[PDB]
Every structure is written in C-alpha cells, then in structure tokens.
Amino acid sequence: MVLYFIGLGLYDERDITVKGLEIAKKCDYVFAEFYTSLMAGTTLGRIQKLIGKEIRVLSREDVELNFENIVLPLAKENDVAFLTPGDPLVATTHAELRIRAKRAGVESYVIHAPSIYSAVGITGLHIYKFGKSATVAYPEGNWFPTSYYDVIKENAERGLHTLLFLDIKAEKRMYMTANEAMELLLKVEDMKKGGVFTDDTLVVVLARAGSLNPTIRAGMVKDLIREDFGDPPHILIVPGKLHIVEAEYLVEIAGAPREILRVNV
Amino acid sequence: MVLYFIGLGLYDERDITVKGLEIAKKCDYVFAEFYTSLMAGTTLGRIQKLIGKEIRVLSREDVELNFENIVLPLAKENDVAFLTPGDPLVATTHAELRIRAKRAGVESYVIHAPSIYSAVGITGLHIYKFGKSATVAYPEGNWFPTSYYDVIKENAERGLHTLLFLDIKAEKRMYMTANEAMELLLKVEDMKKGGVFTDDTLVVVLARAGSLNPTIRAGMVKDLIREDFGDPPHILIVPGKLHIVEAEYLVEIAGAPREILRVNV
Ligand SMILES: Nc1ncnc2c1ncn2[C@@H]1O[C@H](CSCC[C@H](N)C(=O)O)[C@@H](O)[C@H]1O
Fold this sequence. Notes:
The structure is a homodimer of 265-residue chains.
Chain A: E1 2-7, H1 18-25, E2 29-32, H2 44-51, E3 56-57, H3 60-70, H4 72-75, E4 80-84, H5 96-103, E5 107-111, H6 116-119, E6 134-136, H7 147-157, E7 162-166, E8 168-169, E9 174-175, H8 178-192, E10 202-207, E11 215-220, H9 221-224, E12 234-238, H10 244-252
Parallel strand pairs in A: 1-4, 1-5, 2-3, 2-4, 6-7
Antiparallel strand pairs in A: 7-12, 8-9, 10-11, 10-12
The structure holds S-adenosyl-L-homocysteine.
C-alpha cells in the first residue's frame, strides 16, 4: 500500500534506473504524466513493454487537481507507481504530491533517474558554477514573461552560468526550441537594454540529452539563432565567466569558434 | 574504437540505468573510479556481479595523469566503459577526458545516471532556486579555507539555496559528516562574523540519497548539530528564504519544526 515516484530519465525507456524498473515491474497499478518534459526517443508502448504493465497517462489537470482522487485511493490498498520524464522532483511541482500522499495516509518513496539538471555536465561547463535557474516561457496574449532575463543578469554579474529550461505545451505538442528562446531573449533585451543578451552573447545549446548523439553547440547568438539543433527537447545555457578548460571543451566538443579559447580573465 | 562514460548513480548497484547496464555488459573492458565518490550502498563485488564483467579500478592519478595510457589505448580496438559514481562529467575534471579521447582518435559517448545535483530535489527545495555550489573542506596545517562560506553568503542574500558537498577521503574511506560540517561553519562564522551561519540558521541534511529509505532532516543548527543522520554520505544545504510550499514539505516530510513556516518564509 505505498506510492512510488519513479523517474524515467532523459531520452528513452532505457534511461530508467534498474531500481526503478524492478520496482515498477512489481507494482499493482502504474500511472504516469508526460507534460512536464519530452522523452524524444521513446513511446508509451515501448515503456509499457519494458515495464510489463499498462500505463494510465494523466493530464496536468488530473494530477494538479485530482491526484488524490485518481492515484492515492489505489495506493491505500496496492503498490502504485507514478512515472515521469527525467527526475520526478526536478523543475516540477510534484514534490507537493508527497504531502498529499502523507495527508491521505499513504507512504511514498522516490526513485531518481537522470535529469537535465545534471546532464548539463556534458556541455563541459563546471556544474558547480551554475547559478539560479529559470524558464523561458511562451508569451500569452498581452502577457510577456521576462523574469528569466533578470536571472541571467544576476548570474552573469557573479560570473555564474545560467540554465534555461524551455517552455512546453504538451497538449498542443509545442516544444520551445533554443532558437525561439533566443528570439524572445533578444526582444527582452530591446526592451530592458541591460546588455545582458545580445547578438554577441555566447550561448550553449543542448538538445536531446540522453540520446547517444545529442546536439551540443556553442557560439554567439547571431551565429546560432538560425541554426538547426534537431528535434526537441532543447535547453539553452548562458555561460558566465569561463575557465580555460570550459572554453577548450566548448571548442573541441561543442564546435565553438576557436576565438573563445581566448578568455578575458 | 568507442569509449563509454557511464554513471553508476547515487547509492547502490541498482542506481545505474538500464541503458548503462546493457552497454557496460557489451564492453570488452570496464574501468571505474571511486575517488570522486563512493557507492555506500553497495560494493565493488556487487557491481561486478551485476555487470558480469571484471572491473579495473583506477586511482585519481591513473585518471588525471594517465587516462590516455591506461584507458584510451584499449578503446582504440575495443568497446570500453569508464564507470563513475553519480552522473558522468559532473566531477569538475571529467569533461576534459572527452577531449583526451578526441585527441586520441577515440569516439566517446555519455550514458547518464542520477546525480546528487538533481536528487536533492527530494528535500522539497525548488531546483531553480539553488545558486552556486561548493565543497566544505577540512582545514589542515596553516591552511584554513573558507570560500564555501562566501558562497553561502552570496547565494542567501539573493534568496538562493546553497548545495554543500562534504569533504571525503575516498582512499582512507573517511567521510565528513553533516555534524562536522556544521561545527566547521560555526567556527568560520566566529572568524568572519558575517551573520551567515549561526546556531539559529536553518539547514537541511540529506543522507544516503538514492536509497529507498534516505534521511531527510531540517531545522536550526543548534538542534541538528548533535543529531544522528545515519551512515554517509551526507549532503548539507543552507536554504535561502523559503517558498511556503518548500517550508510545508520540509515540515511534513523532513520533520522540520512548525516555526519555519513563519520564520523562514
Ligand atoms: N533530454 C533533454 N534534452 C534537453 N532538454 C531537456 C531534456 N529533458 C528535459 N529538458 C529540458 O527541461 C524542460 C522540462 S523541465 C522538467 C525536467 C525533468 N524533471 C528532469 O529531471 O529533467 C524541457 O522543456 C527542456 O527545456
């Protein structure tokens, strides 16, 4: 009679941990959500096949408004699993679901999986140097989000790197590309004119982390803004002050212009 | 002709991903290092039995100084795996190893696994709110390093959380406990007197992340400094001002005192 929060990882069904698979295989009921992120290398069918169980996919509304009405009731008399892309508690509001579980007298356990938050290490940027993170959200009607711009500014001032999760509208099958994020940021720059994000700003793009051949690119906005980084999901990173080896990796592995090997200490 | 950087995950032999395991099983040679961290919930023997391959352990020197003489030569005409605790390329100097592979004409691929950087989300603290990270190092001789204290200071004043890795002597198998970290920080506070880390400071402790029964505790330093958080590894976090939802999770899940709902929000 417990509830398992199990992450499925970055790209495909094989990104789940062995621990997660063995536990998921023995659960009575299996639920999942695929609106918090995109696993571009798999399908519901493949996940079901691997786990050996049928999976009931839930919408944001099902979860946020009815988690305690759909999932928790079953967890009070069975072993239930709730699957999610990447790590279940990273950049989601799922942690609060553990509180709902407690209040309902249901014990819960978390099985982690690879997350985009730590996968950034593949960009060569020292992970400890990342500062506050943010999300580039799609403008809606007259509402144009801009707080993510101030985050970059705050981190840059401290010489820290900025991780930018990109927006997603799963129900509309919309996945923000690094290109779109760059366009939005340039627009905010025109408004705020803080010299935070311009055509000459160095950026790093990581697409489909978790796949065997992810797209890792680095360069100035003007040169990458119209580049094809492949299918989603994508994340955008605005590095702060670079260490020599970070610059070297970006050039040798991310194909950045040799010009960036030159660091301004 | 191929080198695989494979993460072993957080705690035991089952924290490796299905993808990582299947690939490791297909490799002709398997190397590993346990100097950046140790898998406290398992043993080399259990990891070997799981992968079904003998695992040649490499020391810090083997890797940092002779990676190209020990690992790469074999990767030239065979499939080779390099296992590391957590997620590959998180340890600061590992990304550079991919450059060495390139220089040696060896292709490399990264197989991700859970990292403490994302696993800390189990503390209920929002991932985007974490700022720069640091390691609490033991003082020694005439050397008393305190930069980690400055990191906490800079993050906190900006309302950001600070992830603190605790010192470890892998070879001697000696881990710094959260308790020792707190005493050190209080000692540093007495030195710099910046009102950054005191007996009333709210801290969070995460022990054995990855296990099914991790220890998650939160409260003021004066009340936690003498508490038993169990066996290592331990991770210390000095949260910035809390979102009410973060505070509620710490109270309901981490046994934090009701007081934080008004004092640290
Ligand atoms: N494999 C991947 N490659 C690139 N970006 C990814 C990614 N997986 C997730 N993201 C990024 O993160 C956003 C979802 S945020 C939810 C993250 C998830 N809990 C995790 O642990 O990874 C996406 O819109 C995208 O910008």
